[PDB]
């Protein structure tokens, strides 16, 4: 029940 | 689905106000981020702070803003800005906004809903 | 950073003319760059996210386009209904402490009519 974090910054 | 924000108007420099950002026409299948952004007259959106609004509650803060204001949940549909320590420089309409949260990668990862806004104005 | 600079301060174009406004992040921001339409008096207006998706609703001669540290805003055929402020905004959060929600300081678009 958590939101998800976008990936790392591929960059 | 929308948003109205309250409790602005004048206060003296020095002093306290607490912004109340309602949420109307809302599910809670997702998880969003609800932001406060002001805009001072004639310029610039400057984003203050950020909520999620799952279980964590876990927030997120603009540099030159996280000592003097402080973001909560206060309700399924309600958030609060306190501000504290005001002078001139704190004078603008605050807006509330939402957007989504990254999910699948497919959502809308911005600030897709706003508020009207409410102005305060910290003078003497 | 990542900082938001945008470029030119000011654009003046003829309706059914083209718009380019440019926004530069001060660090690598993959695609995770949303484009506000602000018109004088009223709040601001998601048109574009994640660089070039439009959002519901906003017509399709808006073109969002860029990644890394450089975005573009391209407006074509414009409208009088275009005249207004628009913003570059960071909308990313990758863990508790990495996370950017600026926007940059705003191009005012006027339509000579």
């Known amino acids: 029940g958590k939101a998800m974090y976008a990936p790392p910054i591929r960059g | 689905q929308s948003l109205e924000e309250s409790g602005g108007g004048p206060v003296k420099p020095g002093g306290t106000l607490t912004l109340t950002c309602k949420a109307s026409?809302?599910?809670?299948?997702?998880?969003?981020?609800m932001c406060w952004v002001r805009q001072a007259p004639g310029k610039g959106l400057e984003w203050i702070a950020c909520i999620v609004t799952d279980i964590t509650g876990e927030s997120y803060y603009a540099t030159w803003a996280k000592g003097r204001f402080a973001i909560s949940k206060t309700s399924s549909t309600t958030v609060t800005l306190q501000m504290t320590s005001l002078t001139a420089a704190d004078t603008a309409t605050y807006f509330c906004?939402?957007?989504?949260?990254?999910?699948?990668?497919?959502?809308?990862?911005?600030?897709?809903?706003w508020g009207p806004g409410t102005l305060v104005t910290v003078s003497s | 950073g990542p900082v938001l600079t945008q470029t030119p301060p000011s654009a003046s174009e003829p309706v059914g003319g083209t718009v380019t406004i440019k926004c530069q992040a001060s660090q690598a921001i993959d695609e995770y760059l949303g484009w506000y339409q602000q018109k004088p008096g009223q709040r601001p207006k998601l048109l574009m996210y994640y660089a070039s998706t439009l959002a519901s609703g906003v017509p399709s001669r808006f073109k969002g386009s860029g990644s890394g540290t450089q975005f573009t805003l391209t407006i074509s055929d414009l409208e009088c209904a275009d005249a207004a402020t628009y913003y570059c905004q960071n909308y990313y959060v990758g863990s508790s402490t990495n996370y950017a929600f600026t926007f940059g300081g705003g191009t005012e678009v006027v339509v000579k009519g």
């Open positions: 026409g809302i599910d809670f299948s997702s998880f969003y981020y």
């Open positions: 906004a939402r957007g989504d949260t990254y999910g699948y990668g497919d959502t809308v990862y911005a600030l897709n809903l």
